Scaffold this active site. Structure first.
Site, short mmCIF file in Angstrom:
data_model
loop_
_atom_site.label_atom_id
_atom_site.label_comp_id
_atom_site.label_asym_id
_atom_site.label_seq_id
_atom_site.Cartn_x
_atom_site.Cartn_y
_atom_site.Cartn_z
N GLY A 159 -14.08 -3.70 8.78
CA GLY A 159 -12.73 -4.04 8.33
C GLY A 159 -11.62 -4.05 9.41
N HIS A 177 0.54 3.11 2.92
CA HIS A 177 -0.09 3.38 4.20
C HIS A 177 0.48 2.46 5.28
CE1 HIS A 177 -2.22 -0.05 2.63
NE2 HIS A 177 -2.69 -0.35 3.86
N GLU A 179 -1.54 0.71 8.82
CA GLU A 179 -2.89 0.36 9.19
C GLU A 179 -3.46 1.46 10.10
OE1 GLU A 179 -4.46 -2.37 7.66
OE2 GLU A 179 -2.53 -1.99 6.80
N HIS A 265 3.26 -0.10 3.49
CA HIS A 265 3.14 -0.99 2.36
C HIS A 265 2.22 -0.40 1.31
CE1 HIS A 265 0.23 -2.05 5.39
NE2 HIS A 265 -0.54 -2.46 4.42
N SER A 277 -9.23 -9.69 4.72
CA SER A 277 -8.31 -9.09 5.67
C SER A 277 -9.05 -8.49 6.85
CB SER A 277 -7.44 -7.95 5.03
OG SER A 277 -8.37 -6.96 4.63
NI NI Z 1 -2.70 -2.38 4.67
#
Ligand code: NI
Ligand code: ZN
Length: 345
Positions: A159, A177, A179, A265, A277
């Site tokens: 990911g 969170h 990233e 976000h 993603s």
């Molecule tokens: Ni995110």
């Protein structure tokens, strides 16, 4: 730079096909316009571009580890726990997602669906088909190909440099969170019902952290970066009550969202959908990477070695950083150095 996007509102961009061809240059452009101050930006691709001819041929695709999202709390403050469920196909997932038990409620305006989300968060725990290794892009698509963006992140995690698919249903959530390693992210909604987002500007992220710590004192005590567990749900009403600036946006099928370093976000899916993603980087990320406060309390959390980045892109500071005495202060308003060509010289 503190002049550009002074409200830090989410910006939407409509690239031409020609601009869309060069991914990293277009990211530098949107940062030249102040998009990063919001922490989140929408990019609407040219109407003629499609990453795949059709989604009629994926019912047998496997979702190896779907999770059921149990939520506990009240009064705008919730904790989400993940229950691992048995492997399933997309066909089986779609069936469940569209069933009477799990399907989107009837509503008129977005505000009504949003109210239902926050009222019904703790009931009928949904299944999220999350973190599936893979891509839905055809192998010939060279624009904004989430499987191979070819940013500097490639100097280095599933990911993280690799693409993940997320099969949503109504009321599946992503908690507050940033990233991993305070990276950028890209999210394309391949098909289905919308995804709604909330964001807090990077410049206000420390303010959100302090509020979160006060709302979840136990979690804060046991981990320095407990929001990275992706279990903390906080309603927009609770942010508004404590003066945290935020924005909202709904992402429709065929639209990209970009999240920026240290952009908090959260959000939720409206119904059956599929999104892709991964993470990426620009040169401005390197400083974020070096300063990212990591989860202290789990083994096997994503931790990237910054060494390779600091040697190559910051040779003048390498010895200083390796000794623990790089005290660079991040200015969240500054665009990445790659933006220079779109700014007065
Ligand atoms: Ni995110
Ligand atoms: Zn932790």
């Amino acid at each position: 730079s503190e002049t550009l996007n002074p409200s830090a509102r989410i910006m939407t961009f409509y690239p031409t096909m020609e601009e869309f061809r060069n991914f990293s240059r277009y990211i530098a452009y949107i940062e030249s316009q102040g998009a990063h101050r919001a922490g989140l930006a929408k990019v609407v691709p040219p109407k003629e571009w499609k990453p795949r001819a059709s989604y009629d041929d994926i019912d047998d695709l496997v979702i190896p580890a779907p999770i059921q999202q149990l939520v506990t709390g009240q009064s705008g403050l919730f904790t989400q726990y993940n229950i691992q469920k048995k492997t399933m196909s997309v066909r089986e997932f779609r069936k469940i997602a569209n069933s009477d038990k799990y399907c989107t409620p009837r509503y008129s305006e977005f505000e009504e669906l949003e109210r239902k989300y926050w009222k019904n968060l703790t009931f009928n725990p949904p299944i999220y088909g999350a973190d599936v290794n893979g891509t839905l892009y055809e192998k010939h698509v060279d624009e904004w190909n989430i499987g191979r963006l070819r940013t500097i992140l490639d100097l280095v995690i599933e990911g993280v440099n690799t693409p993940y698919l997320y099969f949503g249903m109504w009321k599946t959530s992503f908690a507050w969170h940033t990233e991993d390693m305070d990276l950028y992210s890209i999210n394309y909604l391949h098909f289905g019902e919308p995804k709604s987002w909330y964001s807090v500007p990077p410049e206000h992220g420390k303010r959100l952290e302090r509020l979160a710590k006060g709302f979840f004192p136990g979690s804060a005590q046991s981990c320095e970066a407990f929001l990275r567990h992706k279990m903390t749900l906080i309603s927009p009403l609770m942010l508004k009550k404590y003066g945290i600036p935020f924005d909202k946006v709904t992402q429709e099928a065929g639209e990209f969202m970009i999240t920026f370093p240290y952009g908090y976000h959260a959000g939720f899916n409206h119904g059956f959908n599929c999104a892709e993603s991964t993470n990426f980087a620009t040169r401005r990320w390197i400083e974020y990477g070096k300063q990212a406060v990591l989860c202290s309390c789990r083994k096997d959390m994503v931790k990237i070695s910054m060494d390779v980045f600091v040697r190559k892109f910051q040779p003048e500071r390498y010895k200083l950083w390796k000794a623990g005495k790089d005290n660079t202060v991040i200015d969240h308003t500054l665009p990445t150095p790659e933006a220079a060509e779109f700014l007065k010289e």
